[PDB]
């Protein structure tokens, strides 16, 4: 129904010790299996504009720093921290994937958290090797991986071409290849709503871990033009088939690149879209536009209402209005002294599991656990309406760098002075 | 779990005023507002304005705006209510009713209730 | 008294079911339908039996149960026992000056 904006989301899968050990530490076998994996997955992704670049492997070998455990929501938030915790710290990536041999309960093969694409703790996947073919296993990368962009389970009615979709959830004789029309509305909407400017940047060419194929879209090292296939390819400075330039070109895809030729040094390739989101320069003998980059930490935005925290502005009323309703606002401050109970909603940090130790807030970080939304929409009870369900207990709780008080954000759950 | 225990009960002549604690445990004082309820002897309930344990903002009902003030401790976790100028039909038992988590206009624990007579 | 109207008293027997009405003007009862109850011993603080009309907390019961219509709002009761010779008050939002008003209460005998 449209062409989406180009979208690049840069991918880290991590394989579990189960899972290592079932190819007798065979490392090259599994990196084959995920190359055609995220191939395919590549492939299904072609009529939504969005491309899926895998940007690091990591092996839990001869250990495992998370308790995988057969309950899926158990292991899933175990994983979700431990990202938030490291990975991120450690690899700059928007997308996170576990991939295990460890059978869960209910024979459910793949679950994720809805909506978290660019959320630290939320955007994180868990996935089961549960076939021998490369196909059907895309089939379920495919399935979460659209469930955290926003998409839900298929809704009668919509089904595509009188047979079942990715979005089915339920298994079937033929594994489908397309999405619902009832699919892209909702991937827009997300777009319009959630707004994840964390995937519009596409990823160096030298940090892509994938080997370099031919027709993709994606430009890796080792191709020196890449416009995809060759049925598609409407730029005249290259040919697909060939997948080298044409005789007389410089370029090929890219951002600073312009007019078939390399713009002059100096002139600006990535703009500002934010107010702490700096602009950069071109080098001058590149067609790759340098690292996107942004201002400090720290800096006040959106008209001092909030600091700026790895280049987003997050705000308290933002995420009242992603949560309930456009016409939210953050509730009252008597509200916020609900996390003092450790109650089985209001708290700061959790065991893992339907059950564990909530902890009791600080009396001074009551603000940097839940977040309670005034909205008089639905039903004028309930003043202070908050988000909570033990498959997504981290939506709802208000996210890293939002503004606590005046001089200070919640960092790591505790409302710490800013520019310490 | 939550418990609330008022003050003994008092006999006041008409034209004096009366105050009445109630004290909060197991739960967060700040985080409820506290209602009061009034039942006179054979009568039905009678309801009086809610105290917010955090700001301190009050409201109160129509037939109570010029009686009644209400004031909080915070540190002790008390709440009080005055009630000025008795009349021989303020008769009655009154009860701190609290909110609670799933609705604001219903009242779940009630403290066991103060009786307050006015009589010569 | 208070604004709301309940009957005046109404008895049962062990074996039997009854219903208890309470009624309000639109403002009152009919309109914002956040009508709850209230069953209050003698000597005994009232304790809260449903709220939302319907909606029910844990820790009583299923012998109770409430209904709306029009600005009508009851409360039935199956299976007389024991515990049900009390007072039952009623108890509704209004969008005036004073936040909740109750019901002039009932007496139920068993
Ligand atoms: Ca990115
Ligand atoms: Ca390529
Ligand atoms: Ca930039």
Redesign the interface.
């Known amino acids: 129904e449209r062409k989406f904006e180009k979208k690049f989301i840069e991918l880290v899968v991590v394989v579990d010790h189960s899972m290592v050990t079932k190819y007798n530490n065979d490392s090259t076998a599994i990196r084959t299996w995920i190359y055609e994996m995220l191939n395919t997955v590549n492939e299904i992704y072609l009529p939504f504009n969005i491309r899926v670049a895998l940007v690091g492997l990591e092996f839990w070998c001869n250990g495992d720093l998370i308790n995988v455990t057969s309950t899926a929501d158990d292991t899933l938030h175990s994983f979700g921290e431990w990202r938030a915790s490291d990975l991120l710290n450690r690899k700059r990536h928007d997308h996170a994937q576990l991939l295990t041999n460890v059978t869960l309960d209910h024979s459910t093969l793949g679950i994720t958290f809805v909506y978290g694409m660019c959320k630290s703790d939320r955007s994180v996947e868990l996935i089961l090797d549960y076939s021998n073919i490369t196909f059907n296993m895309a089939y379920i990368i495919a399935h979460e991986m659209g469930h955290s962009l926003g998409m839900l389970h298929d809704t009668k009615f919509c089904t595509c071409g009188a047979k079942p979709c990715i979005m089915f959830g339920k298994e079937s004789i033929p594994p489908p290849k397309e999405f619902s029309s009832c699919s892209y509305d909702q991937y827009n909407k997300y777009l319009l709503k959630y707004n994840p400017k964390c995937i519009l940047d596409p990823p160096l060419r030298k940090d892509i871990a994938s080997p370099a194929v031919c027709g993709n879209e994606i430009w890796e090292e080792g191709e020196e033009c890449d416009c995809g296939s060759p049925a598609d390819c409407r730029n005249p400075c290259c040919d697909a088939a060939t997948c080298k330039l044409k005789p007389g070109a410089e370029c090929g895809n890219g951002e600073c690149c312009d007019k078939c030729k390399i713009r002059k040094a100096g002139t600006e390739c990535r703009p500002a879209r934010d107010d702490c989101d700096v602009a950069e320069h071109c080098t001058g003998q590149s067609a790759e536009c340098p690292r996107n980059e942004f201002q400090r930490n720290g800096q006040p935005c959106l008209n001092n209402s909030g600091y700026c925290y790895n280049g987003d502005c997050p705000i308290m009323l933002n995420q009242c209005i992603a949560l309930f309703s456009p016409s939210a606002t953050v509730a009252?401050?008597?509200?916020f002294?609900?996390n003092?109970?450790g109650?089985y909603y209001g708290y700061c940090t959790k065991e893992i599991g339907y059950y564990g130790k909530r902890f009791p807030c600080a009396p001074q970080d009551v603000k940097c656990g839940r977040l309670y939304c005034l909205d008089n929409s639905f039903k004028?009870?309930?003043?202070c309406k908050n988000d909570y369900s033990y498959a997504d207990e981290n939506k709802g709780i208000v996210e890293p760098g939002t503004k606590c008080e005046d001089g200070k954000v919640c960092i790591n759950r505790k409302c710490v002075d800013v520019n310490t | 779990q939550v418990q609330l225990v008022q003050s003994g009960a008092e006999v006041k002549k008409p034209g004096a005023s009366v105050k009445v604690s109630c004290k909060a445990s197991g739960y967060t004082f700040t985080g409820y507002y506290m209602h009061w309820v009034r039942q006179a002897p054979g009568q039905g309930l009678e309801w009086m304005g809610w105290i917010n344990p955090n700001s301190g903002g009050t409201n109160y009902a129509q037939k109570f705006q010029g009686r009644v003030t209400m004031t909080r401790d915070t540190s002790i976790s008390t709440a009080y209510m005055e009630l000025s100028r008795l009349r021989s039909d303020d008769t009655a038992v009154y009860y701190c009713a609290r909110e609670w988590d799933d609705d604001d206009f219903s009242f779940d624990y009630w403290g066991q209730g103060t009786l307050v007579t006015v009589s010569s | 008294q208070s604004a709301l109207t309940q009957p005046a008293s109404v008895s049962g027997s062990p074996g039997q079911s009854i219903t208890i009405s309470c009624t309000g003007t639109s403002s009152d009862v009919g309109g914002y339908n956040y009508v709850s109850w209230y069953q209050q011993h003698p000597g005994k603080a009232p304790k809260l039996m449903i709220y939302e009309v319907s909606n029910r907390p844990s820790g009583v019961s299923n012998r109770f149960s409430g209904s709306k219509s029009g600005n009508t709002a009851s409360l039935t009761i199956s299976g007389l026992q024991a515990e049900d010779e009390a007072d039952y008050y009623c108890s509704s939002y209004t969008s005036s000056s004073t936040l909740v008003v109750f019901g002039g209460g009932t007496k139920l005998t068993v």
């Open positions: 009252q401050d008597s509200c002294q609900r003092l109970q109650s004028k009870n309930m003043r």
